[PDB]
Amino acid sequence: GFITALPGMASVFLLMTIIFYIGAVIATKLFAASFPDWFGDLGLSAYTLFQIMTLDDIVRPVMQVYPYAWLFFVPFIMITTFAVVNLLVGLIVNSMQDAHHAEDGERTDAYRDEVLARLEQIDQRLNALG
């Protein structure tokens, strides 16, 4: 399931877009005023929001000029990290059920096959009556 992941990872990655882009709106909706260079254009703040997430090498001057700005950076990081955690938790918990029902899968192919076993045998012995 090379294709279980594909539509799966699609809606996942499409979700990241949504949550990352909404934040990019709020980020620009209130910081673009005084920090255009890299909260300007929506995707520009969107990048830095993601550069904030991926930690590479901004926040303190934005925090200095606008105080109470942690009331956006902290919650939005929580939500992304929430969502990432929640995805993996689901996949984990959802998987443990899948394995739990694997005993039952083998037991099924026992019935599956042993029926077709008789059905050959029954047809066999029947088709030897003519």
Added chain:
Amino acid sequence: GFITALPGMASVFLLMTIIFYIGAVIATKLFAASFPDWFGDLGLSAYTLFQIMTLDDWSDGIVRPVMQVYPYAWLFFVPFIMITTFAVVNLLVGLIVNSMQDAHHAEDGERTDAYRDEVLARLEQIDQRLNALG
């Protein structure tokens, strides 16, 4: 299963590693500067982050001076605790909710072994009466 838990619990506490270790990076990435003794190497802060979680009375002898020297440090300790506690909660919620579905589909399991067995009951009977015509 005995083995339902094993790969399950593996990815679970492989996840704990991830989340605990990421925090250990950020912890060390900004507090290691002025607090090396026990936010020093990565795993060292990682431990205290986990000592903070398991509460062992020395998390109180840690957080306040770090909170004193660096103010706004609660903007890491509070959110990171939330994430771990949310992740632990989320795991158990899933397991609970996922389980209530498993039991919901147990009535159907018995009903299956009725068909399962009564077919094979016929198939013996049908063979039996058939194999008595030769």
